[PDB]
Every structure is written in structure tokens, then in C-alpha cells.
């Protein structure tokens, strides 16, 4: 329910005695947290808005040379001085050209030439600063329960839904608590400042399009710039990059400027992050977030309820949600009130033993109206199983066959953990961790390797990183020595680091 | 004259019985040809007008996306379709998105999404094709004689100038004859097809800027193009090189056009030539010719004249023309009429012996007025010398010292002809050729290695040429064999091929 259609949902179950579980709540992923006694809730980070942008370098990427002039003197008679050479809104270049009797001079030799061109910028790039005391992460939550199919993307009006809530966790209030009426209150304890390392990033703006440009890339590209937010006629130091001073003949000197390099920088942003701007606040469309989840105040609505009595009905026949879950929606025809649907998985009809785990604890009909739609989600076993719901002989059953194997899921979870460890690195030890001497020492021994990899192999791009991965595969399959394991860890360390993209 | 101020003017000697000499007319250089008993002519190519350019493929370098749409389809329910991918001017890509019960569908899985976007171009690059049967070179000639310094580049009037003449050299009429009244007619026999390999170049056009660009470069840059022969709504083949389709993760595919690539191609030429155009015909500023100078019928003006009486006065001081030569401009005072200036260079003034090559043969004042300005050209020997421009005791003697030496001139002209052989390659063996069994064998051995070097070492923009040169120093110092030369002969031959560029 808001987590059922996403491909990258991960299931985090098992706590430190039931107190808390530590999740790395990503922006494109969704997270389903479940216990044996507690209602499972699907928690998804939806936005990351960066507020209150300060201005740093604002480059000029399409310039225009206005009024010019020049002055030349004969050789061995000094160099030229034009009145707009000590002006800093003009760009100026001196050179030595051939000057002889044909030019007007009276001595053959190299003359002296000065060409001044008024630098006038048309439209400029602007690089805003994104600093960690301005973030306001919206994390939507939604508990599994008395809800139907039209409450998955249905978001218009949620403060009066009792099941779903937004918890805007800013680092100005790094811990929050959501009142899930009836279900208790899910408490979050995020670390919004230790997110995507936002002290080392800016928020570039070009032709009303916005990015998250890395800090090292933004302070080195050679293009005409000024200092801050002075939006008048700036100083534009380093104006030589776009203007071009070639050689003057007796009657030709083209000081043409280079054209609009918006396209030259769209082609240079090969690693940036497409953000969007809704005014002064920047809605980012990416980001991982740390969050410890306290659930000891989150309890089951309707555990005391009596079982259902009569007249189920399959509307919207079951379907498989890309992981092995089977979303079955029912329509309970009956006014016995707040009852509990007895749904399970049965291999043998007249054994009715529960064979498949059920992902949404105590599914409950809530409305006292006659035809109440309601949604489940079931985790069948590998193979064949029936969706036995209702009690007695008026039951409504359904055959399901989920194809797969146990060894296939453990490989699909090794791939899910390797892509999590390639995106996060050290943080991937804090996604299903309840703390310990094994799930928190491995990350401390991994932050050292992560610092000796971000600094050692730097940030090499995809192709050259493959080009040095295959070279370390080949150094692995030779160099016959007692340390045969010498250089075969930056091969899986480089391929899985990007072959899993 | 027309040549006395240029830095790389060359002085050529030696004829096949006086009938002809062979030269390669550099476009930035000038050539002074002198014979035994006939006037020295200054020969310069000044323009190269290319008429009748028929255009080819014409790129777009900044696009604009009009109205958008996108359609999705459930898993295993087909593939999506709009009305607008059946229109050739809209760009469209099919991709897979997650669909579920939240997104209205009925089966969970990867859907199908088609995103159409109306391509509209507003800025164009234009490739014009040029064939050698449309070249229009121009050779301005100007002999040394009755000229004053305000007639060096005074191209205002040459059909009655009696000393200066244009010769239009074209593929249709390559041989030409320049009528110089009194001097006869210098016959030229150029070959304009074997100029600057002009059948493998184009003529770009970008915001009223023109270039010479290699055919192979223009047929390789990946930008949305229509074929150029379409003068309506263009087709724009390969539109997908300016638009970018990105799936965020979910049922959302954005389309964003990349920016104006104008500065990306100003920075991507960097090896092209600049060019203007004065109509439909594009005047170039670079190239050369292969020009035979049929000097046989060029006769000397005013040999039978009387000699000058007296009263020569300087108008301005002699100056040294960067080559050791010194130009001296006198003013004859008197009305004897068309007489001959009696000037020569004196070492040991007491005997008054001529010592240096007086460049301007038959120095003749033609106009009979009282004060007539006149120009001479001198080559003093290496050292102290005197410039006598008269007869009797009223002669003019100017002390001249030329700073230099004989072995310094021989190494400056060995490097000067090695830069000339590096710029031209094959043709620089026919810059002063008289037709020999060695100057035409050294040419065949240089054209063979030049074709076995331009095909072996392809395009390398100086930096890789130095990298591979320095790379061949260590491989010419090792691998003891007879081919340690063959890796060191193409060591100096490649880095110095790039040094003086």
C-alpha cells in the first residue's frame, strides 16, 4: 500500500527485541517494516527540498563583444595606450605586428597593437550553495490495514485518513513522531545532515534548469565569472576564455567571441543530478536518508476484533508485485462491523495449514457499510497455494502459483545487497541493522576501505574504471607469487561497483 | 614593392637559360624573382575567391521541444502508441515503467511508455561543397622600377599602372600572361587544381562565420541534420542527438533538449581555417599555388636612357628590411627626364667598387618633373659599407652597418627552408626548382615518404606528435638493431615537424 508497485522495495523485518530498526530510507526506494506483533508500515522518502540558496560563482556562458577600438605606433617608438585599456569592463590585448614603409612607418620591424573589446555578458550561469541547515525531507508513511485499491497513489487529503502521514524531518528537528490514529505513533529519528554529503555540493542553474553540481567540478571550469550575487553589471574576471585575439593584418582583425556554451556544459554535466525548482526552494529528486525507527508506540488496530462471518467477493483478481507477493483485494458484503478477515495460504484444502507468511498483520474490515472494499498482501511459498479467505463453507478461495526457488531468492538478495552496497558503501550496513558486534564492526572496517577507495581510485568514470578493472583482472590471473590474492579485490571491487548500475 | 614589408619574402635565383623558374606561391608569403639582365618582379597571391558553392548536409545546433505527450500500457497488454510517432518530425522512444494497482492498471509489472516530443530547429550549420573547377586565385605582380614608397600596396589603379598587374589564375585558364607596359609580359603557367587539396574540404556557415573544414570532419559530427537539398520543413535525420529521454524510476519519462552546441563546435574546430565571403563566393586567406614563371620574354625598361646628372636628395632614412637588405628612397631634383639613378654599394670608398647585389635592376626615374621621388633596393655585404646614389662630388654616401654574418644567414635559411618543407612537404621542393636530376629525384623520394607518413601517422594535433616523438627517442635508443635509425629517423622528422608550427 504505496509500496506495492515499486520495483526497489526492500523488506526489513526483525528488531532488537522489538524496540527499533535502522533503515536507510532512499528516495526512489520504498521500505516495508514488519514485526511479528506490530502493523507493517511502508515508508518512502518522497522529496528533499533545499531552501534559502546563497549565490557563489555565476559564470557567463554566452558573451557579446560590443564597441571596440585600437591604436598602433611605428616600431622602436613605444607601445600603444588607448583610453579604455585601464578600464576593467573592456578586455584588451597587446601584440607585435609587421610594420614597414607600406604601413606608414619609417622603420621596418614589429610594431605595437592594442585591441580593446567591450565585454558585455548576455545570460549567465548561477551557482547556488546548498548547506545542511536548510533541508526539509518529506517522508511519507502508510500502514497496511483497512484500505482498498484506491488508496495507493491517492494522496489528496491525508491529515484526515488515520492511516497515512507525512513527517517532515528537518535537521532543525532531527527527530519526529507521526500520530497514526488507532495504530499508535511511528517515531522516526533520522540523521538528515549525514545524507548525501551536501557540504560538498552546489545547485547550478542554467537556462532555468537546475542541477546538483559537485564542488570540485564547479570551481574549476574555465569560463568568465564574477564573485557573488551582484546582479548588476559584474566585474567578470577571466574574460579571456570567450574572446579571441588572433593576428591583425593591415585591414583585418577578427576579435570574434566564442558562442553560447550552454550545450558545451550540458555535455560536461555527465554526472550531475537533475533537480527541480518551485520558486526559491529546490525540490531534489534524489537522496538517501538514515532513519532509526522506534515502534514501541506502534501497535495493532483491531487485534481484539471478532472474525468475519459471511460473503466475501474477489474484485480486482490477485496479481504478483514483482517480488513474490500476491496483492488480493476483497469486497466484504456484511454489516457485522469491525471484524477480521481470515486469510491464509493453504496447500491442502482440508488441512488449511498456514504455509505462507502473511505480510499485512490482522487485516481488518473497518466500515459498517455493506460492501466494504479491503486490500491484503500475502507472501506465498514457492510453488502452489490457495488464498483461503473467510471461514466455514461459504469461503472464497483462489489458486496461486508463484514460480521461483529459495536459492533464487538468496541470489536476488545478494544482488539487492550488492547494489545497495555500491550506492551507499558503508551506509549499507545500516539498512537492516539492529546493532551488534558484527553488523556494526563490518561497517567500521568498511569505512576505512571506503576512504582508501574514494581517495585511492578517486572517482574514475564508468569506461576508464572498466578499463582498469579488466587490467586488474589480468594482473590477477598472472603475477605468480605467494600472495596470489594480491590484486584481485579491486576487480570485484570495481566491476560490481559499476557493473551493477 | 608590394613585397618589401613582408617578413617571409624569398629571393630566388637561377633559370633554365633565363626562360622560366618554378615557385610555390605561399598565401602569406611573397616572392622576389631576379635574373641576370631583366627587372626584379614581386609576385603575390592575394585572394582565392571560390564561386558556385552548392550546399550539402546542414546541421541544427540548437533545438526546441514543442508540445509533449506520453502513453503507458499494462504489462503483457501490448506496446504503447500515440498518433504522433507516426509523424516524422516528433522524437519518440519506447521504454518500460512500473505499473500497478495504484497506477490504474490491473497487473503488476513493467509497463510500456512512449514519449513523443515535437522537434523544432532554429539555428543551422551549413556545409557547402567546393570543387576545384570553381577556384579563382589572384596573383598581383609589381616590378621594381620607377616607384615611390607610397606605391607599395597602393592597389588603387593597376590597369594603367605600367608596373602592376593582376593575373586571374583559374582551372579553366591556368596559363596566363601579365602585360607590363615596357617590361613586356611575364608569362605564368600555374596549376590551380593541385592547390590545397581543395576537393577534400567544405565551407561552414554559422551565424555569419565561415570556415574551411575537412570533409572527413564534417561527415562525422553527430548532430541532427537534414540533407540540405530540402528547402521546406526539414526532416532532421538523427534528431535523438539533441534530445535526452530519461526515466526517473517510475511512470515518468522526461524529455529535455541539450543546449546550443555553437560553442561546442567553436571549441571543436580548433584546427579549421577562417573565411569570409563577399556574396555567393567565399574568399579564403590561405593556400598556395604551383607557378611557373616564364621569364624568357620579360625585357628591361630604359637601358638606352641617359644617366642622371645630379641633385639626388633623401626623403627619408634607409631602413633594413629584416633580411639584410636595406631600402633607400631618393628624390631626383632636375629635368633631364627619363634617366637612370647611378647607385651602387662601396667598400673601400676610395676606389668605389660595386660589392653587393643591387636588387632593383635598371633604377629609372621616368617622370621629368623637378622633384620626383624614387625607391631603390640594396643587398650590402656583411659589414661596413656605403650607399652611393650619384656621380661626381655631389654624390650621396650613407654609412651602413648590417648586423649579421654568413654562417648565421646559412643556418637561418636552412631552418627557413625546413619550415617551408614542413608546411608544404612535397611542393616545397619546387619553390626554386629549375628542373634537375636531383631536385626532381629528391622530390620523388620526399613525396613517397610523405604519402607513407600521412597514411601511417594520421591526424595528430601536435600534442600526440610530441608524445610519440619523445616516445620514439627511448625506442631508438634501445632494441639494438639496424632499425634503431628507422625509429630515430622518424623521431626528429616528427617532433620538429610539430615544433615549428
Amino acid at each position, epitope marked *: 500500500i504505496r509500496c506495492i508497485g515499486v520495483s526497489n522495495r526492500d523488506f526489513v523485518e526483525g528488531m532488537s527485541g522489538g524496540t527499533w530498526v535502522d533503515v536507510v530510507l532512499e528516495h526512489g526506494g520504498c521500505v516495508t517494516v514488519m514485526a511479528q506483533d506490530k502493523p507493517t508500515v511502508d515508508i518512502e522518502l518522497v522529496t528533499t527540498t533545499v531552501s534559502n540558496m546563497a549565490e557563489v560563482r555565476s559564470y557567463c556562458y554566452e558573451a557579446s563583444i560590443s564597441d571596440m577600438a*585600437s591604436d598602433s*605606433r611605428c616600431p622602436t617608438q613605444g607601445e600603444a595606450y588607448l*583610453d579604455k585599456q585601464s578600464d576593467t569592463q573592456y578586455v584588451c590585448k597587446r601584440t607585435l605586428v609587421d610594420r614597414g614603409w607600406g604601413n*606608414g612607418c619609417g622603420l621596418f620591424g614589429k610594431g605595437s597593437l592594442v585591441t580593446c573589446a567591450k565585454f558585455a555578458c548576455s545570460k549567465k550561469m548561477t551557482g547556488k550553495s546548498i548547506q545542511p541547515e536548510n533541508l526539509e525531507y518529506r517522508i511519507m508513511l502508510s500502514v497496511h490495514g483497512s484500505q482498498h485499491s484506491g488508496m495507493i497513489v491517492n494522496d489528496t487529503g491525508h491529515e484526515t485518513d488515520e492511516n497515512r502521514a507525512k513527517v517532515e524531518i528537518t535537521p532543525n528537528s532531527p527527530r519526529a513522531e507521526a500520530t497514526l490514529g488507532g495504530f499508535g505513533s511511528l517515531g522516526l529519528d533520522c540523521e538528515p545532515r549525514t545524507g548525501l554529503d551536501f557540504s560538498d555540493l552546489y545547485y547550478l542553474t542554467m537556462n532555468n534548469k537546475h542541477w546538483l553540481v559537485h564542488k570540485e567540478w564547479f570551481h574549476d571550469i574555465p569560463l568568465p565569472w564574477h564573485a557573488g550575487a551582484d546582479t548588476g553589471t559584474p566585474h567578470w574576471n577571466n574574460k579571456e576564455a570567450l574572446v579571441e585575439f588572433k593576428d591583425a593584418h*593591415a585591414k583585418r582583425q577578427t576579435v570574434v567571441v566564442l558562442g553560447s556554451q550552454e550545450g558545451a556544459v550540458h555535455t560536461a554535466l555527465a554526472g550531475a543530478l537533475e533537480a527541480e525548482m518551485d520558486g526559491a526552494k529546490g525540490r531534489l529528486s534524489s537522496g538517501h536518508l538514515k532513519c532509526r525507527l522506534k515502534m514501541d508506540k506502534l501497535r495493532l488496530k483491531g487485534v481484539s476484533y471478532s472474525l468475519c462471518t459471511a460473503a466475501f467477493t474477489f474484485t480486482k483478481i490477485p496479481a504478483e508485485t514483482l517480488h513474490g507477493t500476491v496483492t488480493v483485494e476483497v469486497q466484504y458484503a456484511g454489516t457485522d462491523g469491525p471484524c477480521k478477515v481470515p486469510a491464509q495460504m493453504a496447500v491442502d484444502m482440508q488441512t488449511l495449514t498456514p504455509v505462507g507468511r502473511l505480510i499485512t498483520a490482522n487485516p481488518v474490515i473497518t466500515e459498517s457499510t455493506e460492501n466494504s472494499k479491503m486490500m491484503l498482501e500475502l507472501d506465498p511459498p514457492f510453488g502452489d497455494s490457495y488464498i483461503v479467505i473467510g471461514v466455514g463453507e461459504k469461503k472464497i478461495t483462489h489458486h496461486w502459483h508463484r514460480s521461483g526457488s529459495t536459492i533464487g531468492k538468496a541470489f536476488e538478495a545478494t544482488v539487492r545487497g550488492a547494489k545497495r552496497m555500491a550506492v551507499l558503501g558503508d551506509t549499507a550496513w545500516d539498512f537492516g541493522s539492529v546493532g551488534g558486534a558484527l553488523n556494526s564492526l563490518g561497517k567500521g572496517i568498511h569505512q576505512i576501505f571506503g576512504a582508501a577507495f574514494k581517495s585511492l581510485f578517486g572517482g574514475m568514470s564508468w569506461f576508464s574504471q572498466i578499463l582498469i578493472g579488466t587490467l586488474l583482472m589480468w594482473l590477477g590471473l598472472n603475477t605468480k607469487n605467494g600472495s596470489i590474492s594480491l590484486m584481485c579485490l579491486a576487480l570485484g571491487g570495481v566491476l560490481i561497483f559499476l557493473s551493477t548500475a | 614593392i608590394r613585397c618589401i614589408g613582408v617578413s617571409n619574402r624569398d629571393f630566388v635565383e637561377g633559370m633554365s637559360g633565363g626562360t622560366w623558374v618554378d615557385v610555390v606561391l605561399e598565401h602569406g608569403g611573397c616572392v622576389t624573382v631576379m635574373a641576370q639582365d631583366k627587372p626584379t618582379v614581386d609576385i603575390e597571391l592575394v585572394t582565392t575567391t571560390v564561386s558556385n558553392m552548392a550546399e550539402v548536409r546542414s546541421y541544427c545546433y540548437e533545438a526546441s521541444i514543442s508540445d509533449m505527450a506520453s502513453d503507458s500500457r499494462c504489462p503483457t497488454q501490448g506496446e504503447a502508441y500515440l498518433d504522433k510517432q507516426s509523424d516524422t518530425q516528433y522524437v519518440c522512444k519506447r521504454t518500460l515503467v512500473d505499473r500497478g494497482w495504484g497506477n490504474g492498471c490491473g497487473l503488476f509489472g513493467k509497463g510500456s511508455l512512449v514519449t513523443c516530443a515535437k522537434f523544432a530547429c532554429s539555428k543551422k550549420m551549413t556545409g557547402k561543397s567546393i570543387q576545384p573547377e570553381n577556384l579563382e586565385y589572384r596573383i598581383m605582380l609589381s616590378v621594381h622600377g620607377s616607384q615611390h614608397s607610397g606605391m607599395i600596396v597602393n592597389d*588603387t589603379g593597376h590597369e594603367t599602372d605600367e608596373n602592376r598587374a593582376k593575373v586571374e589564375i583559374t582551372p579553366n585558364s591556368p596559363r596566363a600572361e601579365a602585360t607590363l607596359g615596357g617590361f613586356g609580359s611575364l608569362g605564368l603557367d600555374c596549376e590551380p587544381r593541385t592547390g590545397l587539396d581543395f576537393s577534400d574540404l567544405y565551407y561552414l556557415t554559422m551565424n555569419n562565420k565561415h570556415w574551411l573544414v575537412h570533409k572527413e570532419w564534417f561527415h562525422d559530427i553527430p548532430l541532427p541534420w537534414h540533407a540540405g537539398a530540402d528547402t521546406g520543413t526539414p526532416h532532421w535525420n538523427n534528431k535523438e542527438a539533441l534530445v535526452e529521454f530519461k526515466d526517473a524510476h517510475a511512470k515518468r519519462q522526461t524529455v529535455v533538449v541539450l543546449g546550443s552546441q555553437e560553442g561546442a563546435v567553436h571549441t571543436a574546430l580548433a584546427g579549421a581555417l577562417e573565411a569570409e565571403m563577399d556574396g555567393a563566393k567565399g574568399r579564403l586567406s590561405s593556400g598556395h599555388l604551383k607557378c611557373r614563371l616564364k621569364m624568357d620574354k620579360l625585357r628591361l625598361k630604359g637601358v638606352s636612357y641617359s644617366l642622371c646628372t645630379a641633385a639626388f636628395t633623401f626623403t627619408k632614412i634607409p631602413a633594413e628590411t629584416l633580411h639584410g637588405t636595406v631600402t633607400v628612397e631618393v628624390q631626383y631634383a632636375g629635368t633631364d627626364g627619363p634617366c637612370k639613378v647611378p647607385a651602387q654599394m662601396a667598400v673601400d670608398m676610395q676606389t668605389l667598387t660595386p660589392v653587393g647585389r643591387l636588387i632593383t635592376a635598371n633604377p629609372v626615374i621616368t617622370e621629368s618633373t623637378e622633384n620626383s621621388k624614387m625607391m631603390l633596393e640594396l643587398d650590402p655585404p656583411f659589414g661596413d659599407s656605403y650607399i652611393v646614389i650619384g656621380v661626381g662630388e655631389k654624390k650621396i654616401t650613407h654609412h651602413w652597418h648590417r648586423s649579421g654574418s654568413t654562417i648565421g644567414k646559412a643556418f637561418e635559411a636552412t631552418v627557413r627552408g625546413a619550415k617551408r618543407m614542413a608546411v608544404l612537404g612535397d611542393t616545397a621542393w619546387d619553390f626554386g626548382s629549375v628542373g634537375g636530376a636531383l631536385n626532381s629525384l629528391g622530390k620523388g623520394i620526399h613525396q613517397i615518404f610523405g604519402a607513407a607518413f600521412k597514411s601511417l601517422f594520421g591526424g595528430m594535433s601536435w600534442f600526440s606528435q610530441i608524445l610519440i616523438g619523445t616516445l620514439l627517442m627511448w625506442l631508438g635508443l634501445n632494441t639494438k638493431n639496424g632499425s634503431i635509425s628507422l625509429m630515430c629517423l622518424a623521431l626528429g622528422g616528427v617532433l620538429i615537424f610539430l615544433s615549428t608550427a
Partner: antibody
Amino acid sequence: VQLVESGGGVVHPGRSLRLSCAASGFTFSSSAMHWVRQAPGKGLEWVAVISYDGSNKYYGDSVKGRFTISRDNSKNTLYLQMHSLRAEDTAVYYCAKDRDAYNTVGYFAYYYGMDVWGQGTLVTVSS
Amino acid sequence: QSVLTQPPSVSEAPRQRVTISCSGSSSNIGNNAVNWYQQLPGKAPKLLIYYDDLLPSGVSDRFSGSKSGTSASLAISGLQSEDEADYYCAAWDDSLTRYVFGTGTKVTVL
């Protein structure tokens, strides 16, 4: 850029007559000058140019050697004197500034042509 | 030639392009750049295009210049109800060493 002429007069052919003009703000020594004539009922006709020093000083082939243009650097003022002056040369006069310096006039003087004028005052040479 | 003839008067409908064709010779136009000038009804002239295709600051972008051989075609596009003024060509000829003006080009809006 603020330039104004002065020195009109009505004089019969063959005596002295002068005009003058000046400006400020920018530098006057490192710029050139040129005096322009404009007969009513006609367009404009050029008169003379002065370099940034005065050595190079060129007059048009209409009234060569007959009008004398005078100024130099350290005065910030332009003059124009005329004596033994032709009869129907009466016209408005203009003090425009060719935006260059004319150390050479046609070689490395790419950007010639004058920026900003002022509405001057004409003279009258008639009976 | 030092006369520099060019058409006296031109009448073009508004919002279309107007050409001014100058045919000098290689004395002035055919070797170095050409200038072009704007003299107001009452006020004094100003320059419009120096170096034959450039625009000084302070003038509308309606104008544009060109210089092909001895064909100087100047272009005022989108003629409106204000430029009822005269237009002048000018170039330096270096042999006769003069700054030759033009004859005159008046346009009327209609």
C-alpha cells in the same frame, strides 16, 4: 561625449574667420578629430582630419591648403581658421571625433568613423 | 572616384526591409571598411555601422551592414514612423587620401 561647436560669422570672401569646440570626461589627447562641412540644400562634405598629435594632418582635395585646423593635446580645445576663403563654401560645420588616433590613417585604423557630434553653427560667405 | 553615388530616395512599406546600395570602387570600399550615418531631421548626424557590419552602443538593432567588393548594401529592417531622416555613406580612400561622404539617402514612412 558632450561636444558643442561655436564661432559662427557672416564674412565676405577674403578675410579671416574662426570656429572652435571642446569636450571632456574621456581623454582628448589619445583621440583624433575631424572637421566636417555641410551646405544647406546638400548633404555633407568632408573637410579635414587631425591625429592624436597633429603631425599626421590631412585635408580634402576640395579646399587643400586653404583652411587651417589647429589644436594639440594639452589644451582640450579644437580650432578652425579660414582666410582668403572661397565664396559659396558657406555651410554648417561639425566637430566629429573619428574614434581612432591616426598614427597611421589607413593601416591599422580598422575602426575609423566618428562617434558623437553636436549641433553646430554655420557661417555665411556672400554679398 | 571620390563621389560615391547611391540612390537618392527610397519609399518602403512599414515592417519590411529597406536596402541602401553604395557603389564606390576599390579605392575606398574595395580595400578597407565602410561606414554609414544617420542625420536627424533637426538634430545632427550620428554613426550607425562602423567597420561595415558593427553596431555602436546606443542604436537599435534594426540595422545591419555589408560590404561585398564595391557593393555596400546597408539594411534597415522594419521601417517605422520615426526614421524620416537622411542616411549617409562614408569611406577613407588611401590613394587620394580623403574621407569621402555619400550623396544622401532620404526615406519616407508609408
